[PDB]
């Protein structure tokens, strides 16, 4: 699939969107920008 998700981008210091295929991958993968920044934001 192509599903818009969020990950923390260490080069930007904040979360950014990416297309996720729907299975596998890793845990740097959040369904909203808010949730991403609550976990990985400074």
């Amino acid at each position: 699939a192509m599903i818009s998700r969020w990950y923390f981008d260490v080069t930007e210091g904040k979360c950014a969107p990416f297309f996720y295929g729907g299975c596998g991958g890793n845990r740097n993968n959040f369904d909203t920008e808010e949730y991403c920044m609550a976990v990985c934001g400074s």
Binding site: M2, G22, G24, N26, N29
Partner: peptide, 13 residues
Amino acid sequence: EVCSEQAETGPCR
């Protein structure tokens, strides 16, 4: 650290 891992679209993309 989870937050430093690469974005991974995974094998269903």
